[PDB]
Amino acid sequence: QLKTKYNDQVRPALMQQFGYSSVMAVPRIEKIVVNEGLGSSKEDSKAIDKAAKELALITLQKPIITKAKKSISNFKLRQGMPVGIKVTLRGERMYVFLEKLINIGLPRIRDFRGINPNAFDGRGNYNLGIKEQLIFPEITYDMVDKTRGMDITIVTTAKTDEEARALLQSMGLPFRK
Amino acid sequence: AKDGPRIIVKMESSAGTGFYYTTTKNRRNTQAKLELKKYDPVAKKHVVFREKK
Amino acid sequence: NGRDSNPKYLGVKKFGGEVVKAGNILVRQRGTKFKAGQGVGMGRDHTLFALSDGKVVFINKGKGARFISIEAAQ
Amino acid sequence: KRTKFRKQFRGRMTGDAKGGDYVAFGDYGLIAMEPAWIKSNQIEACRIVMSRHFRRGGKIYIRIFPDKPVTKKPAETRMGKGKGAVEYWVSVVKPGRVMFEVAGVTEEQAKEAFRLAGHKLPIQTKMVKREVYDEA
Amino acid sequence: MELTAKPRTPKQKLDESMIAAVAYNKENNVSFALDRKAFDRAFRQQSTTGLFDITVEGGETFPALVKAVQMDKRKRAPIHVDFYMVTYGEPVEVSVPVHTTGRSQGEVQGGLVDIVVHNLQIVAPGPRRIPQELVVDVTKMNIGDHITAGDIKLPEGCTLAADPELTVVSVLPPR
Amino acid sequence: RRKLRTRRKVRTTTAASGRLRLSVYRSSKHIYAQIIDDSRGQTLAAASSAALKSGNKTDTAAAVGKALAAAAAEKGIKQVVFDRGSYKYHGRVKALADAAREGG
RNA sequence: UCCCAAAAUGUAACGGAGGCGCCCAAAGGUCACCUCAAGACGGUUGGAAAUCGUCUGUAGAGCGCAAAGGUAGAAGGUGG
RNA sequence: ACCCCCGUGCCCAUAGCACUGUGGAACCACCCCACCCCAUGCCGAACUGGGUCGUGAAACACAGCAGCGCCAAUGAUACUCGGACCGCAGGGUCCCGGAAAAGUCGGUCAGCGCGGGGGU
Ligand SMILES: [Mg+2]
Ligand SMILES: [Mg+2]
Ligand SMILES: [Mg+2]
Ligand SMILES: [Mg+2]
Ligand code: NA
Ligand code: NA
C-alpha cells in the first residue's frame, strides 16, 4: 500500500534530472495538517459534533478542537472558546489519507481543472485550496448534518520551490497546463 | 474584611472526635459543597477533617 | 489629585565588606533584582537574608543579574 | 502648532542648548542668542509673515514644534488645585537652537523674511551661513 | 598652518587666538594646537575633502585630513577639531558635498530645484585623489523628477556608500 | 528544546547541597555518566561505555551504572544527586540509577 | 502604585495620574509538561483581526484587578 | 607529548547571527521498525522502546569570512564638589578638582579547566 512508489518513482528521478549527492537531501513529505473552520459567524454547539465526527472518519484520527487566540477586537471575538480544528497527519496515516486523496479526492471533483501551478510557500512547502467537502469517498451527505469546507496543507522537507513542485507532481498532483 | 449577604462565607473547622479550628475563607461561587479537607489537631494527628459546618 | 500618599521603604540594608550575622536582612526589593547567591536566602517579598556569619560580598556580571554572597572570616 | 494628544500638565526649567545645528534642510537659517519660551501663536505669526514675503516656494522649514502645556488663572482666588488645563503651548528655545530655515531665495531675500519674523520673537536672534558639517 | 607648542592645559590658548586640535591614525596620537585664523582661512577652502601641510615645531611635516569639527554654540568660532593622517591606499571614508550647475528645465516652468542631501558620504575616496566637489546634472529634470545616487557620475575609482535608491536632488512644485 | 536540561541544572542546588552531582548523556547509544564536583569544575570517578560493550547498547545500561558505583568506592563517595536532561526517568536511565544506587 | 523626592532612607501642598474595602476549591502544595505577542507568504462558511502551517522573533506577551519593580532556566499555560 | 570527538563547567555577545567550506563508521544526527512498559487533551514529530543500511544533505562540530551586531580609546565638551562673582529676572561667567553620554579611531566572531573515548 504505497510507500514503494514513494521512493522508486521519486528519488531516482532526481539525481538524473537535478543532481543530488545525497539520498537524504531528497525532498520528503514531513506531514499533512488539516484545518477546519467552526464558529465565528456560526456559533453552534451542535456544529461541533459535526466536524468532530466527519474529520474522524476521513482521516482515521481524532482531531483537536483548538480555541481562540485570546484576542477581542470590535466584532464577534471572545477570549477562550472552541473556534477551530487541527488534524495533523504524519506517519502511515499520512500516506493513507494522501493516497485516498490523489486517487479518489481530486479526480472525483465537479468542475475540476487542477490546482494553481504557481509556487505558493516559497520556503519549500505547498498549500492546497480545498473547499466543498462533498468530493470525498468518506463524506456521505446521506448521513451527516450539513455541508462545510475543509483545508489541507502540505508540509515537506524541501529546500526550494523547484525541488518541491517536482516532488508533488511525481507523487500525484495534476496542474492546469 | 467586610461581612455581608454577598458571595463567599467564612467557614469554621471541625473534626471527628478531635477539636480544632483552621478558620478558612471559602466561597460558594463555583464548587461550594465538597469542603472536605485533612488537618491534624493536637491528638494522634492525621484525621478526617472537614471545614463544612 | 493631591490625594493619596505612600511612605514606602526598600533599598539595600547590608552593603559590601560588611560583617553580618545569621538572621540579619541584606536587601529589600520588590522583584528579582538582587538574586540570592551563596549563603544568601530569599524571603517571600524577595528579601535577602543571611544564613550564617561572614562578609557581604557583591557581584555584578554586567547588570541584569545581581548576586550577593557571604565569605566566612574565622 | 499644537500637539494631537499628550498627558496634560508639566513643569518648568532651562538648561543650555542641546540639538540645534546651523545648516539643516536648506541654505539659510535663524538662531537664538537668548533662552526663552516660544508660544505657538508666535511661530504661526512667523511662518505666516514668511509666507507673505515668499509668494511661491513653500520651502520654509520650521522644526520647533510646541510641546509644552502652560496653565492659567481662571478668575481669581487661589483655593483649588491645578488650574487652566488649556491655555497655550510653548516650545522651549535655547541659544544655538535653529528655529527657522529657508532655501532657494537670494541673499537679500533672506535678510527680509528673517528680519520680519525677528520682530515677532521675545528674544534677539541672528542669521548664519553654511560652513559647518558635523554629522550627516 | 605652522604648529607650535602642544600641551594639555588650555591656559595659554583661550586668551590668545589659538584653537585646540588633535590628530591620529593608528600609531601615534599626540595632541596638537593650531592657530585660529590659520584654520578659519584654510578650512574654508579644502573643508573636509582636502589635506593640508601640517609642520610641527621642529621640522615634522605630517599630512592630514579634517574629520570632525566641534564648533562652539552661541558663537560662529569653532573650539575643537579632529584630524586624520591619511595613509596611502585605504584611509577613512570621506564625505563629499553635492553642488549643482546649469539651470534646470523645471525651475523655469514654475517648480524649484531642491537638493535633498547636501553632503554625501562615499566609500574609498582614494588618497592623493580626493573629490573636493561633485558635479551632478540638473537640467535633465522637470517636475517631480527624482535623482538618486545611481544617477551621479563617479569621479573614477570611487564607490558609493548610501543606498542606491536615495533621493539626492528633487525638483519640488511651486507654492 | 534545550530548556529541559537547564530545568534540572538550576533546579539541583550546587551550594547549599554540598553534595556531588552525577550527570548522564544518553541521547544516543553511548552514555558517559560523568561525575562532577559541586564547587570544583573537576571530575572524580566518571564511567565510560565506549571501552568495549560486548555488542550491546541497551543492556549495558545496568552495567555502566554498577561499574560507576564500584568506581566511586575507590574515591570515597556516599551521597549522589542525579541530573539527567531530556530524560523522563523511564527505562535505561532508571537502570543506571538503581545499579548505581544499590551497588554503592 | 508612580511622579514631585533634587541618585541611602525620608520628606509638604485644596500639586500632577490611576486603584482597593476583593477574588481563586482552585488561581494552593508538589510533581511533570508545554513557550509568547506580532508580521510576512499561502489556504475553505473568512477576504480587518482569528482558525492552520511553515519562517522570523530576548519576549515588542502573559501574570484575576491599579501601577512599578520583576520574571524565558518562570513567579506564562495544563495534567496527576 | 599531536590532533580530534563526546560530555560537563568557568565565563553568562570584544565569545551573536548571516553567508561559505570541510567532516563520514571512532564519535554525533537523521533514518527503520515500534502489538507491549511509557506517551503526545490529535498524531510514537517531541517524550520513548528495539537497532541495520544509507547519508552528513539538515542538525551538530570545526574553519574561513568582521556585511550587520557586540565591545569600545585619545582629545574636547555637557554636568558637578568646593571656592568666589554678575543680571530686575528668566539666567549666565571665573578659579580649582572630579568627570558623561553620544560619535570617532580601533578592537576582535573568544579565552581558560576537568573527565571519557578513538586515532598518528
Ligand atoms: Mg533653574
Ligand atoms: Mg529617594
Ligand atoms: Mg538625594
Ligand atoms: Mg513635613
Ligand atoms: Na558652586
Ligand atoms: Na572644569
Closest CA to F82 of F28, F29, F33, F44: F33
Reading phi first (left if > 0) and then psi (alpha if -120 to 50, else beta), residue D45 is in alpha
Say whether both E175 and E91 belong to one domain: yes
β C11-12/C25-28 pair status: antiparallel
Give the Cα-Cα-Cα angle C29, C34, C40 (nearest 5 degrees).
100
Measure the CA dihedral E117/E118/E122/E128, to 10°.
170
Judge: D134–E175 Cβ closer than 8 Å, yes or no.
no
Contact E97, E118 (CB under 8 A): yes
C52: amino acid identity, one letter: S
Which residue range forms the structural domain that includes residue E141? 87-175
**Measured between CB atoms, does E45 come within 8 Å of chain D?**
no
Name the closest residue on chain E to residue D54, using Cα atoms.
Answer: E175
- DSSP class of A101: I
Q: Compute the distance between CA of residue B26 and CA of residue B35 in angstroms, rounded to an integer.
A: 8
Q: Provide the angle, in degrees to the nearest 10, between the axes of the packed helices D40-53 and D108-118.
A: 150
Q: What one-character-per-residue DSSP string does F59-71 give? A: THHHHHHHHHHHH
Q: What residue type is C69 in one-letter code?
A: S
Q: Choose one of E36, E53, E86: the last residue of a domain.
A: E86
* C-alpha cell, C60: 555584578
- At position E147, the amino acid (one-letter code) is I
Q: Pick from A126, A132, A137, A141: which is nearest to A103 by CA?
A: A137
C-alpha grid cell for residue F94? 532508571
CA E120/CA D86 separation, integer angstroms: 44
On the CB side of F38, CA atoms within 13 Å amount to 14
Q: How many CB atoms lie within 10 A of CB C40?
A: 23
Task: Identify all chain D residues contacting E95, using CB atoms and an 8 Å cutoff.
Answer: 133, 136
Q: Is D118 on the interface with E (CB under 8 A)?
A: no
Instruction: Specify the residue for cell string 488539516.
Output: A34
DSSP A63: P
CA separation for the pair A24, A28 (Å, rounded): 9
Chain E nearest-CA residue for D23: E118
CB F93 within 8 A of CB F65: no
Distance between CA atoms of residues B23 and B8, nearest Å: 13
**Which residues have C-beta within 8 Å of that of residue F58, sequence separation ≥ 6?**
F29, F92
Gyration radius of chain F over CA positions: 13
Number of Cβ within 10 Å of residue B38's Cβ equals 10
Q: Considering CB atoms only, which of E71, E95, E172 is closest to D136?
A: E95
Q: Are residues E93 and E174 in the same domain?
A: yes
CATH number of the domain residue E110 falls in: 2.170.120.20
DSSP string, D7-66: -S----------S--SS-SSSEEEEESS-B--BHHHHHHHHHHHHHH-SS---EEE----
Q: Which amino acid is at E85?
A: M
- C36, C42 in Cβ contact below 8 A? yes
Of A81, A102, A87, A76, which is closest to residue A9 (Cα–Cα)? Answer: A102
Name the protein residue, with chain letter, whose CA is nearest the C1' of G33.
F4
* Residue located via cell numbers 456521505: A140
Q: Which of F3, F31, F20, F7 is nearest to F93 (CA)?
A: F31
Asked if A54 and A133 touch (Cβ cutoff 8 Å), the reply is: yes
CA-CA-CA-CA dihedral for F72, F74, F77, F82, to nearest 10: -10
CA of E69, closest CA in chain D: separation in Å?
Answer: 6
**Pick from D104, D130, D133: CB nearest E95:** D133
E73 and E11: one domain? yes
Interface of E with D in 67-106 (CB under 8 A): 68-71, 73-74, 76, 95, 97
CA of E48 to C1' of H19 (A): 36
Burial class (CB in 10 A: 0-12, 13-18, 19+), E21: buried
Q: How far is CA E167 from CA C17, D25, D46, E125, E140, in A?
A: 61, 14, 30, 21, 15
* Structural domains counted in chain C: 1
Query: The domain spanning residue E62 has which CATH number?
Result: 2.40.240.10
**How distant is the alpha carbon of residue E130 from its chain centre?**
10
Same domain, E72 and E12: yes
Q: CA of E109, closest CA in chain D: separation in Å?
A: 13
- Cβ contacts of F90 within 8 Å, gap of 6 or more: none
The residues with which A115 forms a beta bridge, in sequence order, are A175
Closest CA to F31 of F4, F56, F61, F8: F61
| Domain shared by E63 and E7, yes or no | yes
Residue at grid coordinates 537670494: D106
DSSP E30-63: -B--EEHHHHHHHHHHHTTS--B--EETTTEE--
| Distance in Å, alpha carbon of E173 to nearest chain D alpha carbon | 8
Distance in angstroms (rounded) separating the CA atoms of residues A37 and A149: 7
Angle among Cα D50, D51, D55 to the nearest 5 degrees reads 120
Task: Report how far Cα E18 is from the mean position of its chain's Cα atoms.
Answer: 22
In Å, how far are B12, B24, B37, F74 from B20, measured between CA atoms? 10, 12, 13, 55
DSSP string, F17-71: T-SEEEE---SSS-----EE-SSSS-BSS---SSS--TT-SSTHHHHHHHHHHHH
Gap between the Cα atoms of A75 and E110, Å rounded? 51
- The residue among A6, A3, A22 whose CA lies nearest residue A171 is A6
φ/ψ of C38, rounded to 5, equals -75, 125
Cβ–Cβ below 8 Å for D133 and E47: yes
Domain extents in chain F? 11-104
In sequence order, which residues have a C-beta less than 8 Å from that of residue D131 and are 6 or more positions away?
D22, D23, E44, E76
Nearest by Cα to A61 from A138, A173, A1, A131: A138
Same domain for E168 and E93, yes or no, is yes
Q: Tell me which H or E stretch contains E122.
A: strand E119-123
- Return left, alpha or beta for A146; rule: phi > 0 is left, psi -120 to 50 is alpha, else beta: beta
Domain that holds residue C71: 10-74
Beta bridge partners of D82: none
E39 and E101: one domain?
A: no
**CA–CA dist A153, A136 (Å, integer):** 16
Residue length, chain C? 74
Q: Give the amino acid at F2.
A: R
Return d(Cα D59, Cα F102) in angstroms, integer: 89
* Distance of F50 CA from H26 C1′ (whole Å): 9
Residues E159 and E102 in one domain: yes
Beta strands C34-36; C66-71: pairing state:
parallel
CA dist list (Å): A64 to A44, A113, E18, E59:
17, 32, 81, 86
Reduce the DSSP state of residue E90 to 3 states and report it.
coil
The DSSP call for residue E17 is T
Residue E16 one-letter amino acid: E
Contact C40, C10 (CB under 8 A): no
| Partners of residue F90 on adjacent β-strands | none
Cα D61 to Cα D51: distance, rounded to the nearest angstrom: 11
Do residues F67 and F96 lie in contact, with contact meaning Cβ atoms separated by under 8 Å?
A: no
Q: Which amino acid is at C15?
A: F
* C-beta contacts of E45-48 below 8 A and 24+ residues apart: E46/E132, E47/D133, E47/E97, E47/E132, E48/D133, E48/E94, E48/E95
- Provide the grid cell at D65: 514644534
Q: Which residue is nearest to nucleotide H42 (CA to C1')?
A: A63
D127 touches chain E (CB under 8 A): no
Choose the CATH number for B1-53 among 3.40.50.2300, 3.50.50.60, 2.40.50.220, 2.20.28.120: 2.20.28.120
- Domain holding D23, by residue range, is 18-136
The CATH number that applies at residue D46 is: 3.90.1170.10
Question: Edge to edge, what strands does the sheet with E159-160 contain?
Answer: E95-97, E119-123, E159-160
Chains C and E touch (3+ CB pairs under 8 A): no
Q: Please give the torsion angle defined by the CA atoms of residues E108, E118, D99 and D115, in that order, rounded to the nearest 10 degrees.
A: -50
Cβ within 8 Å of E, D 14-73: 16-17, 22-23, 33, 56-59
Domain assignment present for C22:
yes
Taking an 8 Å cut-off on Cβ atoms, the answer to whether E71 and D103 are in contact is: no
Query: Pairing between strand C48-50 and D60-62?
Result: unpaired
Whose CA is closest to B17, among B53, B51, B44?
B44
Q: Is residue A55 within 8 Å of residue A37, measured between CB atoms?
A: no
CA–CA gap between residue E39 and residue E70 (Å, rounded):
13
Q: How far apart are CA A13 and CA A166, in angstroms?
A: 10
DSSP state at residue E153: P
Contacts of F94 (CB under 8 A, 6+ apart): none
Helices then strands, counting H and E runs in chain A, come out as 4, 4
In a domain, C4, yes or no: no
Q: Which of residues 42-81 of D touch strand G (CB under 7 A)?
A: 79-81
* Residue closest to A52 by CA, chosen among A127, A128, A148: A148
Give, to the nearest 10 degrees, the angle between helix A162-172 and helix A92-100: 70
Q: How far is the CA of E164 from the centre of ligand 3 (A)?
A: 53
Q: Is residue C46 part of a domain?
A: yes
* Helix residue spans in D1-136 (DSSP H): 40-53, 108-118
Question: Cα(D122)–Cα(D135) distance, rounded to whole angstroms?
Answer: 30
Q: What is the CATH number of domain F11-104?
A: 3.30.420.100
3-class state of residue C60 by DSSP:
strand
Residue of D131, D134, D135 to mutate when probing chain E, most E C-beta within 10 A: D131
Helix (H) or strand (E) holding A164: helix A162-172
End-to-end CA distance of chain D: 28
The reply to whether E59 and E108 lie within a common domain is no
Residues of D within 8 A of E114 (CB-CB) are 59, 103-104
In order, the DSSP letters of C11-47 are: EESS-TT-EE-TT-EEEE-SSSSEEE-TTEEE-TTS-
Q: Which three cell numbers stand for residue A82?
A: 472552541
| Amino acid letter, D12 | R
Q: Are strands C66-71 and E135-137 parallel, antiparallel or unpaired?
A: unpaired
- Angstrom resolution of this structure: 3.2
Is position D3 within any domain? no
C-alpha cell, B11: 467557614
A12's CB contacts (< 8 A; 6+ apart) are none
Distance CA E159, CA C44 (A): 62
Contact at CB, E174 and D132, closer than 8 angstroms: no
DSSP secondary structure letter of residue C56: E
E44, E48, E73: residue with CB nearest D133: E48
E47 touches chain D (CB under 8 A): yes
Contact state of E119 with D16 under an 8 Å Cβ cutoff? no
Choose from D133, D134, D135 for mutation: most chain E CBs within 10 A. Answer: D133
Residue type, A57: L
Experimental method: X-ray
Spatial separation of the C-alpha atoms in residues F81 and F83, rounded to whole Å: 7
Determine whether the distance from the CB of D8 to the nearest atom of strand G is below 7 Å.
Answer: yes
Give E77's contacts (C-beta < 8 A, 6+ positions apart).
E36, E40, E71
End-to-end CA distance of chain E: 47
Q: How wide is the angle at C-alpha D72 spanned by C-alphas D69 and D74, nearest 5°?
A: 140
Quote the Cα angle for A62-A63-A68, to 5°: 155
According to the 3-state scheme, what is the secondary structure of chain A?
CCCHHHHHCCHHHCCCCCCCCCCCCCCCEEEEEEEEECECCECCCHHHHHHHHHHHHHCCCCCECCCCCCCCCCCCCCCCCCCEEEEEECCHHHHHHHHHHHHHHCCCCCCCCCECCCCCCCCCCEECCCCECCCCCCCCHHHCCCCCEEEEEEEECCCCCHHHHHHHHHHHCCECC
Give rounded-to-5 percent helix, strand, coil for chain A.
30, 20, 55
| Alpha carbon distance E87, E102 (integer Å) | 36
Q: Is D128 on the interface with E (CB under 8 A)?
A: yes
Total structural domains within chain D: 1
- The residue among E86, E102, E123 that closes a domain is E86
Protein-contacted bases of chain H (C-beta within 7 A): 6-13, 26-30, 37-38, 41-52, 54-58, 73-79, 90-93, 95-96, 103-107, 113-118
Element (H, E) at E171: strand E167-172
Q: Does C49 fall in a domain?
A: yes
Q: Provide the residue type at A150 as one letter.
A: M
Domain ranges in chain B?
A: 1-53
| C-beta atoms surrounding C23 within 10 Å | 10
- Please identify, among E52, E86, E120, the residue that sits at the C-terminal boundary of a domain: E86
Q: Which of A137, A127, A122 is nearest to A173 (CA)?
A: A127
Let me know: does C15 contact C26? Beta carbons within 8 Å.
no
Dihedral sign (CA D7, D12, D18, D23):
positive
